[PDB]
Amino acid sequence: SGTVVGIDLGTTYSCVGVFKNGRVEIIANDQGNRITPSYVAFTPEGERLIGDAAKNQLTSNPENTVFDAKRLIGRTWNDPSVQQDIKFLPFKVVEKKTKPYIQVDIGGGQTKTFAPEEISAMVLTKMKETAEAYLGKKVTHAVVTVPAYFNDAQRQATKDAGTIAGLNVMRIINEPTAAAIAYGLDKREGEKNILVFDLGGGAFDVSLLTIDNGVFEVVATNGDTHLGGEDFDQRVMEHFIKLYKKKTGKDVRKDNRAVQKLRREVEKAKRALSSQHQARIEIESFFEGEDFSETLTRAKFEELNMDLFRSTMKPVQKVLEDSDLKKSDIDEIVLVGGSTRIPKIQQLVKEFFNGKEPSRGINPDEAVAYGAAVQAGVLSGDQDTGDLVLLDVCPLTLGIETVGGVMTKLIPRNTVVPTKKSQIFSTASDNQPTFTIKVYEGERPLTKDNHLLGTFDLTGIPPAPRGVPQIEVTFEIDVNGILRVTAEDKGTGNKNKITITNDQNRLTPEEIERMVNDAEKFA
Amino acid sequence: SLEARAALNQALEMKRQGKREKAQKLFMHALKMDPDFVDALTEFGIFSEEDKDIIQADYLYTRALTISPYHEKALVNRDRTLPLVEEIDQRYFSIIDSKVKKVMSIPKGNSALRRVMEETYYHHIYHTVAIEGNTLTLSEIRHILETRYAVPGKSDEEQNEVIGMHAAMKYINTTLVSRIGSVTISDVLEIHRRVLGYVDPVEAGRFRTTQVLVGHHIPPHPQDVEKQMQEFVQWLNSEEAMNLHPVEFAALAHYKLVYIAPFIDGNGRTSRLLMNLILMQAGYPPITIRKEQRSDYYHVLEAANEGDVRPFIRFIAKCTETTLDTLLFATTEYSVALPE
Ligand SMILES: *P(=O)(O)OC[C@H]1O[C@@H](n2cnc3c(N)ncnc32)[C@H](O)[C@@H]1O
Ligand SMILES: [K+]
Ligand SMILES: [K+]
Ligand SMILES: [K+]
Numbered sequence: 001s002g003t004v005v006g007i008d009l010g011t012t013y014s015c016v017g018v019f020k021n022g023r024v025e026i027i028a029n030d031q032g033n034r035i036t037p038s039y040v041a042f043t044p045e046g047e048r049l050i051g052d053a054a055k056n057q058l059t060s061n062p063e064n065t066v067f068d069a070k071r072l073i074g075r076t077w078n079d080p081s082v083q084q085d086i087k088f089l090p091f092k093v094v095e096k097k098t099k100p101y102i103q104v105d106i107g108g109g110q111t112k113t114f115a116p117e118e119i120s121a122m123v124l125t126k127m128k129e130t131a132e133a134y135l136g137k138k139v140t141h142a143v144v145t146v147p148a149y150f151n152d153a154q155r156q157a158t159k160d161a162g163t164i165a166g167l168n169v170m171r172i173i174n175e176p177t178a179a180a181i182a183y184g185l186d187k188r189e190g191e192k193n194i195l196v197f198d199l200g201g202g203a204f205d206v207s208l209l210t211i212d213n214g215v216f217e218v219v220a221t222n223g224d225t226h227l228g229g230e231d232f233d234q235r236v237m238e239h240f241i242k243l244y245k246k247k248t249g250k251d252v253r254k255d256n257r258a259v260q261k262l263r264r265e266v267e268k269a270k271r272a273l274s275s276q277h278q279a280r281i282e283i284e285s286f287f288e289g290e291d292f293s294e295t296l297t298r299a300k301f302e303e304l305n306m307d308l309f310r311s312t313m314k315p316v317q318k319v320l321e322d323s324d325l326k327k328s329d330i331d332e333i334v335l336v337g338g339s340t341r342i343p344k345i346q347q348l349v350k351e352f353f354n355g356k357e358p359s360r361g362i363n364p365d366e367a368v369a370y371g372a373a374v375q376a377g378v379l380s381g382d383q384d385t386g387d388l389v390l391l392d393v394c395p396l397t398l399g400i401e402t403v404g405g406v407m408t409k410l411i412p413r414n415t416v417v418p419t420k421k422s423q424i425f426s427t428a429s430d431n432q433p434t435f436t437i438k439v440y441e442g443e444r445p446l447t448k449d450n451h452l453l454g455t456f457d458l459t460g461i462p463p464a465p466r467g468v469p470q471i472e473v474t475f476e477i478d479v480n481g482i483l484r485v486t487a488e489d490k491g492t493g494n495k496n497k498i499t500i501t502n503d504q505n506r507l508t509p510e511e512i513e514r515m516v517n518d519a520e521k522f523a
Numbered sequence: 524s525l526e527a528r529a530a531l532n533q534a535l536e537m538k539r540q541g542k543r544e545k546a547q548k549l550f551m552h553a554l555k556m557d558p559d560f561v562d563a564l565t566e567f568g569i570f571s572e573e574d575k576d577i578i579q580a581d582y583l584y585t586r587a588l589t590i591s592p593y594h595e596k597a598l599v600n601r602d603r604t605l606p607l608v609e610e611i612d613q614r615y616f617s618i619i620d621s622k623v624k625k626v627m628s629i630p631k632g633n634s635a636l637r638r639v640m641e642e643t644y645y646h647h648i649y650h651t652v653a654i655e656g657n658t659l660t661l662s663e664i665r666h667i668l669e670t671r672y673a674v675p676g677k678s679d680e681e682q683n684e685v686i687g688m689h690a691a692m693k694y695i696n697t698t699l700v701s702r703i704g705s706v707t708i709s710d711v712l713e714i715h716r717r718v719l720g721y722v723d724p725v726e727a728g729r730f731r732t733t734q735v736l737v738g739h740h741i742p743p744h745p746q747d748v749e750k751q752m753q754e755f756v757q758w759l760n761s762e763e764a765m766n767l768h769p770v771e772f773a774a775l776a777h778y779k780l781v782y783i784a785p786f787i788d789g790n791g792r793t794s795r796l797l798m799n800l801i802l803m804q805a806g807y808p809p810i811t812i813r814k815e816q817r818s819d820y821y822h823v824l825e826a827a828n829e830g831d832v833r834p835f836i837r838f839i840a841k842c843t844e845t846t847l848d849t850l851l852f853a854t855t856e857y858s859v860a861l862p863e
C-alpha cells in the first residue's frame with residue numbers, strides 16, 4: 001500500500017493530494033502548478049510530453065496533441081457525443097473494436113494507435129510522478145475520482161487506466177462525494193443536507209448528501225457525463241468559425257492550427273468573461289497568414305450557451321424530486337469546478353434556491369482531489385483518520401433485456417452500494433442452451449431507449465422444454481459502483497455449473513498487460 | 524475491516540442519538556464490508572430487539588455465536604432471547620393446532636369440504652411441479668388426470684411429471700398414511716419411483732451415482748448417500764423426532780432429505796410428499812408451498828445450509844397456517860336469520 005494518493009482525473013485539469021500528518025496536501029507539479037492539464041503530446045523528435053508542456057505546444061503540433069480522453073473512455077464509436085467532440089479535436093479518432101482509438105505520429109515517421117484508457121493512464125502517470133517527487137518515494141496505490149453519473153464502462157475504463165499506469169486503484173470515488181468530504185471534514189455541526197453542483201471541463205453532476213459528523217450519505221444523484229467547459233468552448237469556437245466564413249468566405253476547419261489557436265484564445269476569453277463584461281479574441285497568422293481580431297461580450301457568450309446553462313437546473317430539480325425534499329431543506333449549496341465561476345451559472349443556481357448564497361468553504365478546483373486524498377488516507381489504514389463512512393449510490397437503473405425488448409429492472413437508480421439483486425428467469429424456446437444476458441443502464445421501459453452496459457453469454461443450460469429451467473441471474477454492484485453478473489440453476493443439476501463470459505467489447509486481460517508493458521517503456 | 528469498524532462505530536452513535544433509520548443503514552454497511560463481523564451481528568441484534576423483533580435479534584445473536592462460540596456479549600444476549608423465541612414459536616404452533624381442530628370441527632355433512640379437498644389435490648400437484656418450473660396450468664393438470672388425454676403442444680416430460688405426482692400421492696394415501704410401523708428407505712424409494720417413473724424410468728426409485736448441485740447447496744458425494752439416508756430414517760422413527768411438534772418434525776424431515784438430495788432429480792417433489800405424509804400421519808391436513816413463495820423457500824433453505832433451520836421451520840408453519848385458513852374460508856357457512 002505504502003503512501004496512498006488521491007487523484008482528481010479531470011476532463012481538462014487533474015489534481016493530486018496526499019493525507020499526511022493529520023491533513024491534506026495538494027501537490028504542485030514540476031512547474032509549481034497545483035493543477036495539471038489532462039494533455040499528452042508526441043513531439044516530432046519522439047519526446048512524450050504530459051501536462052503543461054503538452055498543452056503549451058498544442059497550437060504548433062495539434063495533430064499529435066491528445067486531450068478530452070475522459071469524454072472518449074467507456075463509449076462506442078457511433079456515440080453522438082464522440083462524433084460531436086471529433087469536430088473540435090485535432091488528433092485522428094479511428095474506429096477499433098467499435099470504440100474510438102487515438103492515432104498519432106509518435107516521431108520519425110511511424111504512427112501509433114492508443115486506447116483512450118492509455119491516454120488517461122499517461123495523465124495518471126504524470127499525477128503519480130508529481131506525488132513521487134513531493135513524497136521522495138515510489139507511489140503504487142491511489143484513490144481515483146469519477147463523475148457520479150459515470151456508467152459501468154466509464155468506471156471500469158478509469159480503473160483500467162489506473163492499471164495501465166501501474167497504480168493499484170484501491171477505490172473509485174464519485175467526484176461530488178469527494179467534494180462533500182472536502183466541505184464536511186472540518187464540520188462538527190451535526191446533520192446537514194448539502195447540494196453539490198459540480199460543473200467541470202467535461203462532466204456535470206448534482207448530488208444531494210446528508211452529512212453527519214463523519215457520515216457522507218448520498219440521498220440522490222443525477223448528471224450528464226458530456227456537459228461542461230469543453231461544450232461552452234465548442235459553442236464559442238463554432239460562433240467564430242461561422243463569423244470568419246461570413247467575413248472572408250474561408251473555412252477554418254481546413255487548418256487544425258487555426259481551429260486549436262481559436263480554442264486557446266476562446267479558453268482565455270471564457271475565463272476573462274467571469275470577471276469582465278467583454279474579451280478581445282486576437283490570433284496572429286490565424287489562417288493563410290491572415291490575422292483574426294473579434295470581441296466576445298459576456299451577453300454573447302451567455303446567448304451562445306444559454307440552453308446548456310439552463311439545462312444544469314434539470315438535475316437539481318431531479319435530485320430534489322428523487323429525495324422528496326424541498327428547496328428549503330438544502331442547508332448549503334457547494335459549487336465545484338472552474339465552470340461554476342461563470343456568473344450566469346451562479347445566478348441560475350442562486351435564483352433556483354430563491355436567493356440562497358452558495359457556501360465559500362471549498363476551493364472549486366482542488367475540492368475533488370482533497371476528498372480523494374482523505375479517502376486514500378482512510379484506506380491506507382495508518383493515517384489517524386476518524387470514523388469516515390461513505391454511503392454512495394448507483395446513478396443508473398440496471399436491468400436485463402427480456403422477451404419483447406423489455407427493460408426488466410433489477411437495481412433502481414440511487415440504490416446504496418455495495419448491493420446485490422437476484423431474479424429467476426427461464427428460456428424462450430425448447431432445449432435453449434444459452435442466455436444472451438443484455439444488461440442495460442437507464443430509466444426507460446424498453447431497452448432500445450436505454451444504454452447497453454454489456455452482453456454476457458451464459459452457457460450450459462441443460463436441455464428442457466421452453467420456460468422450464470429456473471436460472472437465477474444476480475447483479476452485484478461493488479463499492480466502486482461496478483457490476484458483476486453471476487447465475488445459478490435453482491433446481492437439482494450436474495456438477496458442471498452454467499458459466500458466464502462477458503462480451504469482449506472491453507479491454508481483455510491480454511490487451512491490458514500489453515498496454516501496461518508498453519507504458520513501462522516511458523516510466 | 525477498518526471500514527466495517529468505522530461503520531459499526533457510526534451505527535452505535537446514530538442509534539444513541541435516535542437516528543434509527545441511519546443506524547440501520549450503517550449496521551447493514553458494516554455487514555456488507557464484513558459479513559462475519561461478530562460485534563456488528565450482535566449490535567444489529569440488539570437494534571432488532573429494541574424494535575421488539577425478538578426472532579430477528581435471536582437469529583443474529585445465534586449467527587454471531589456460530590462464528591464465535593465464546594463471544595461473551597452474543598452469549599448473554601442469546602441466553603435472554605432463547606426462552607422468548609421458544610415462547611413465540613410454540614405460540615404459533617398452538618394457533619395452528621387450534622385451526623387444525625377447527626377443520627376437524629367442520630360438520631360431516633358439509634358439501635364445500637369435499638369440493639375444496641378435490642380442488643386442493645390438483646392445487647398441490649400444480650404448485651409442487653410449478654416450483655420446479657413445470658408450465659402446465661391447474662386446468663391442464665385436472666384435464667390430464669381426469670381425461671388421460673395429452674394437452675396439445677405441451678412437452679411429454681411436463682405431463683409425465685404430473686402423472687408421476689398423481690401416482691405417488693395415490694400410493695402414499697392408500698398404502699402409507701393409514702399404515703402402522705416405521706417409515707423405511709424402501710418407502711421413500713417407492714414414492715420417488717412414482718414421482719420420476721413416467722419421466723425417467725431408469726433413475727426412478729434409486730439413489731444417484733453422480734455428484735449433483737442444488738442451487739447454492741452441495742449435497743453429500745453419492746458414495747455417502749446410503750449412510751446419510753440410514754441415519755435420516757433412524758431419526759424419522761426415533762422417540763426424539765416423535766416428541767417434536769408435528770410441524771417441526773415435518774419441516775426438519777423435508778430439510779434433511781433435500782440436504783442429502785439422494786436422487787438425481789425429484790428431491791423437492793419427494794421431500795414435499797414426505798413432509799405431507801408425516802403431517803397426515805399426525806392428523807394434520809397436507810400443506811402446499813405455493814410456486815409464488817419459491818424465492819422465500821430457497822432463501823430459508825439457504826439459511827438452514829448456513830446453520831439455522833428455524834427460519835425454514837417458521838416458513839413451513841406459515842404454509843401450514845395458510846393451507847388451514849384456505850380450507851376454513853372455503854367451508855364457512857353463512858347463517859340465515861329470521862327477521863322476527
Ligand atoms: P432437485 O431438482 O431434485 O430438488 C430441488 C429441491 O431442492 C431443494 N433445495 C433448493 N435449494 C436448496 C438449498 N439451498 N439447500 C437445500 N435444499 C435446497 C428444494 O426443496 C427444491 O425443491
Ligand atoms: K464535474
Ligand atoms: K450532453
Ligand atoms: K455535449
Ligand SMILES: [Mg+2]
Pocket residue numbers: 010011175199200201337368
Ligand atoms: Mg471536476
Ligand SMILES: [Mg+2]
Pocket residue numbers: 491492655788789790
Ligand atoms: Mg428437479
